[PDB]
Structure 1
């Protein structure tokens, strides 16, 4: 379900955005609230771990985000995504609803992702 190669640098910035939005804004953890946020257009950025297994758990997110035109990016570790999201365990996906202080960072990420997709 990984549709493009994310530079290590950009992935770290996405984890930074999640950390910041976590402390200063509003984020959703887990595929259920992430999916719902995308469908309702509430998500400003969706972060998806590349190591989810079964894949079916998050496989629907890339196509859904494209269908709804919501920015999305992959991070290599669900463990680190969960950590950035504030939990000690893995998080398959996260949705940033309110960037908080990460408003600009999210926009930079969305812009760079737009290019990766061409």
Structure 2
């Protein structure tokens, strides 16, 4: 079990973060892969970031949790890098995905941010 999944994720909200990627894909502004995640996670106003649960080495995404604590942004995760690539719409994998504008996903990002902030507390 990797060191970056610092809270236990329930049978809810994970599929809503997957759905938030699916519907931001043609309607928002979005980046995919961990280095493009990293620059849109530093720069401008990101709204949400998503990670896979099977990233190996774990070290490549282990930077994203402390980087979200310095800058007041929420994070969440989903069960597979190959499914996260397919959610972004690429036939390879993705270790992480970042939302710059939610498009359709704005009410989903508001529900996720409200529920995760009181979970980790």
TM-score, structure 2 as length reference:
0.92
| Structure whose residues are more often helix by fraction | 1
Q: Deviations over 1:30-73 (max 9, x none)?
A: 11111111212421000011110011110100110111111111
Please provide the CA RMSD for this pair.
1.1
Q: Which residue of 2 aligns with 1:30?
A: 33
* Bigger radius of gyration among the two: 2
Distance 2:93 2:27 in 1: 21
**Number of residue pairs the alignment of both structures matches:** 118
Q: Give unmatched runs, 5+ long, in structure 2.
A: none
Q: 1:41·1:70 contact (CA, 8 Å) conserved in 2? A: no
Counterpart of 1:23 in 2: which secondary structure? coil
Task: Evaluate the alpha carbon distance shift between residue 52 and residue 25 of structure 1 in structure 2; reply closer, same or farther with a 3 A threshold.
Answer: same
TM-score by length of 1: 0.94
After superposition, the Cα gap between the structure-2 partners of 1:41 and 1:65, relative to the gap in structure 1 and judged at 3 Å, is farther
Equivalence map 1:45-64=2 (5 Å): 45-64=48-67
Runs ≥4 residues deviating over 4 A: none
Give, in angstroms, the shift of residue 109 of structure 1. Answer: 0.8
- 3-state DSSP class of the match of 1:3? coil
